[PDB]
Write a protein that binds this ligand. Structure first.
Ligand SMILES: Cc1ncc(C[n+]2csc(CCOP(=O)(O)OP(=O)(O)O)c2C)c(N)n1
Ligand SMILES: Cc1ncc(C[n+]2csc(CCOP(=O)(O)OP(=O)(O)O)c2C)c(N)n1
Ligand code: SF4
Ligand code: SF4
Lengths: 195, 195
């Protein structure tokens, strides 16, 4: 079973107690690429999206039908996508625009929830999230309180107030701030995708 | 008529006594672009090839049926070409490869001319050109001596020796070293063509 430990994730020993979310890929024995991505998944894999350029990182990272990126016990893990060899930077840039747009729709539904007859504990977590929606730790902190209070709050609501809470529940996957990562080889970064 | 003067071309006064090879373009009144290219034509227009990106410099520089680039009294002037907006640097890079290839074919025909029964004055200019074929001034100096001696040399030759001199006459336009210039706007250089 999982064991909650307070080892500092900023150290080598503390980081390896986190579950790896990149495992058993098709890279060569002793590859110099996969250890880097594996460490990133152990630190921020809970909330990251990957835009991967075509290359080795896309061949051992995304050759059908096997996917080396996995999830933790909570079912959360990095979402992985590879478009083309030359557009990987702009591909990931587009994701950052969209993810910000999805969080903006949620913040609007949360601000409207403040004006609705909902529980005082629910209003407390919403105000805390709006102030730290762009902070990785704070958005996870107040977001989880919102996720925990939503099912009981929806049961106690009705009419258009219930629809407002149901719209927040539909977008609760954008409470936690995401981390966009654009991964590629030197051939992509130094040549075809440098522009 | 043309007046040979020994004013230093490196000064402003000396450069303007050279004939401009960019005249009467379609640029705006007081454009900040055309004065730059005009000065380049007055210095090296005798032996330059232009790879121009799409933009203002291609619209006032190459809108049919009027061409603003002209020639001097000797009939020599810049050759101008525009491929696309995004490839102008590689377009001009390809020209530099080809021009070097054309000079290489000429140097082979000149080295073979040293082994042929030709005039002593012709052999003197060929040895001088081979040593300075990559120097702008020296290649023009010894090249013009070769161009001046060729018609009399061809008249005095026969057989395969005459064919060797006729092959040099076919390539005499690559004695003088060329100057490849890649002209474009900031939109080309900073964005789409920066890679
Ligand atoms: C537009 C385009 N050009 C070329 C290719 C072929 N291609 C696939 S991967 C690759 C190079 C990978 O080198 P690098 O970016 O350094 O990644 P690495 O494999 O070294 O990790 C190339 C040229 C392609 N798929 N698409
Ligand atoms: C592939 C492509 N994209 C866009 C264009 C349209 N286009 C023509 S000129 C130009 C911009 C010119 O700006 P700049 O490079 O700064 O030159 P300037 O006109 O300022 O001298 C653009 C976007 C094109 N012709 N081709
Ligand atoms: S980068 Fe590619 S080829 Fe090189 S060791 Fe890793 S998997 Fe093998
Ligand atoms: S750059 Fe183009 S638009 Fe600007 S002054 Fe020159 S010709 Fe006119």
């Amino acid at each position: 079973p999982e064991v909650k430990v307070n080892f500092n994730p900023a150290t080598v020993k503390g980081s390896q107690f986190r579950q790896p979310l990149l495992e058993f890929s098709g890279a060569c024995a002793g590859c110099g690429e996969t250890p880097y991505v594996k460490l990133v998944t152990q630190l921020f894999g809970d909330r990251m999206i990957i835009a991967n350029a075509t290359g080795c990182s896309s061949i051992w990272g995304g050759s059908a039908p096997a996917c080396p990126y996995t999830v933790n016990r909570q079912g959360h893990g990095p979402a992985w996508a590879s478009s083309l060899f030359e557009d990987n930077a702009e591909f990931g840039y587009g994701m950052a625009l969209a993810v910000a747009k999805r969080q903006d729709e949620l913040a609007t539904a949360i601000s409207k929830a403040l004006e609705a007859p909902v529980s005082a504990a629910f209003k407390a977590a919403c105000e805390g999230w709006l102030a730290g929606k762009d902070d990785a730790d704070r958005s996870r902190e107040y977001g989880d309180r919102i996720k925990a209070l939503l099912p009981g709050e929806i049961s106690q609501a009705s009419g258009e107030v219930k629809d407002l809470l149901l719209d927040i529940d539909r977008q609760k996957d954008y409470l936690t701030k995401k981390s966009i990562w654009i991964i590629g080889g030197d051939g992509w970064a130094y040549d075809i995708g440098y522009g």
